[PDB]
Amino acid sequence: CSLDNGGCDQFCREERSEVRCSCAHGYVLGDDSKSCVSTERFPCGKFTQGR
Amino acid sequence: IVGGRDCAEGECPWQALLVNEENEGFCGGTILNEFYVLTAAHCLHQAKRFTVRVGDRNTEQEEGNEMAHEVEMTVKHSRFVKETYDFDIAVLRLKTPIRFRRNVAPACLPEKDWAEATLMTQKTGIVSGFGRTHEKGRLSSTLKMLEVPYVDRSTCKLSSSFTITPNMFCAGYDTQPEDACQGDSGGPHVTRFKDTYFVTGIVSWGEGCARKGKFGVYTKVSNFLKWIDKIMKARAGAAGS
Amino acid sequence: YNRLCIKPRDWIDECDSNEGGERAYFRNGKGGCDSFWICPEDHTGADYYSSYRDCFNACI
Numbered sequence: 001c002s003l004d005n006g007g008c009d010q011f012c013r014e015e016r017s018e019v020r021c022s023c024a025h026g027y028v029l030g031d032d033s034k035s036c037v038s039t040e041r042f043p044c045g046k047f048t049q050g051r
Numbered sequence: 052i053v054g055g056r057d058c059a060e061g062e063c064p065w066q067a068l069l070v071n072e073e074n075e076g077f078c079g080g081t082i083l084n085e086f087y088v089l090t091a092a093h094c095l096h097q098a099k100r101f102t103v104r105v106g107d108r109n110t111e112q113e114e115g116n117e118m119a120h121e122v123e124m125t126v127k128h129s130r131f132v133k134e135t136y137d138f139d140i141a142v143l144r145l146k147t148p149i150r151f152r153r154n155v156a157p158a159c160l161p162e163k164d165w166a167e168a169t170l171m172t173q174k175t176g177i178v179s180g181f182g183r184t185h186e187k188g189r190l191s192s193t194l195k196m197l198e199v200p201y202v203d204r205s206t207c208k209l210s211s212s213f214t215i216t217p218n219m220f221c222a223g224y225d226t227q228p229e230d231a232c233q234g235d236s237g238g239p240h241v242t243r244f245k246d247t248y249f250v251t252g253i254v255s256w257g258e259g260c261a262r263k264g265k266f267g268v269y270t271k272v273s274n275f276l277k278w279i280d281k282i283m284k285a286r287a288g289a290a291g292s
Numbered sequence: 293y294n295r296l297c298i299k300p301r302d303w304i305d306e307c308d309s310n311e312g313g314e315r316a317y318f319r320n321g322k323g324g325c326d327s328f329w330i331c332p333e334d335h336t337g338a339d340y341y342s343s344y345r346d347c348f349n350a351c352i
Contacts, residue, residue: 001165001168001169005169005244009245009247010165010244010245010247011161011162011165012165012169013164013165022162024159024160024161024247024249025159025160040151041151042064042151042152042155042156042157043156043157044065044156044157044158044159044247045065045157045158045159045241045243045246045247045248045249046156046246046247046248047061047062047063047064047156047248048060048061048062049060049061049153133300134298134299134300134301136295182293186294186350187346187349187350188349212336212337212338212339213295213336213338231293232293232294233293233294234293235293236293254293256293256294256295257293257294257295258294258295258296258338258339259294259296259339259350260293260294262339
């Protein structure tokens with residue numbers, strides 16, 4: 001993990017050698033293993049309006 | 052909050068003013084989800100009704116946007132040592148869920164290791180509330196945000212008269228004029244990591260406000276994670292702790 | 293927040309400045325502040341409220 005946290009949009013773990021990124025509640029990771037897509041409409045740790 | 056700007060629209064949507072038996076606020080919380088507000092367990096001692104107004108930004112102007120909820124259940128971590136302010140936490144359930152909207156969205160809870168390593172090694176955190184705008188001076192009828200730097204444990208130990216316990220971290224300014232304050236207890240400490248903000252603390256306590264040589268002390272939520280979540284499904288009795 | 297406003301039970305302190313009690317005004321039972329003569333042994337050493345004015349405006 002550590003340098004640029006791990007290529008992932010939020011969480012990261014060291015799984016034997018590799019970094020196993022995950023996401024917070026209601027974010028689904030991307031087919032990368034890195035991004036966490038917003039599942040809700042107003043989700044956790046986001047603030048503002050539209051666009 | 053002594054110092055630091057008012058919060059604009061958008062800004063602090065994971066706040067909660069725990070209001071009382073008539074219409075004054077006395078402590079703060081974080082929206083964790085649409086049924087539970089997070090707060091400091093010492094707050095539950097200055098109230099009778101703790102009517103949760105979620106949506107309120109600038110008190111005075113008590114016009115439509117806000118919404119008071121009442122509570123269905125409060126839980127204080129059993130180990131909360133009362134004039135110790137240790138394990139100073141409560142998640143409380145509400146009867147009426149939160150339809151998030153403008154100025155209402157939840158704040159994310161981290162997971163313990165990424166939290167110490169990545170998040171709490173960041174320079175600053177954001178704390179908010181309507182509490183006192185100076186120590187010997189009264190309450191902001193405005194939700195204010197203060198960006199505040201994490202201090203080092205070793206340093207803020209010396210600085211206190213009271214015991215900083217494993218469960219605590221301080222943050223703020225020493226000489227600079229800005230701190231958390233009276234009636235901000237419970238209100239959120241969030242850390243953004245690249246546009247997700249996470250909850251790193253609860254506002255716990257202080258010796259006065261914006262004090263000299265003195266930093267503000269918060270409840271380290273990393274250390275509190277599984278507790279929150281246990282309670283997250285079985286509310287009621289405090290359990291194990 | 294302000295931990296200077298309390299120590300909430302009554303500690304035991306009939307300690308004169310002869311004994312080394314500090315006078316402090318902790319808030320009393322709603323309305324306003326008290327006056328207590330904080331015994332040496334019990335003294336945490338916190339910068340407590342010297343007075344009624346600046347203790348009431350501070351803690352009430």
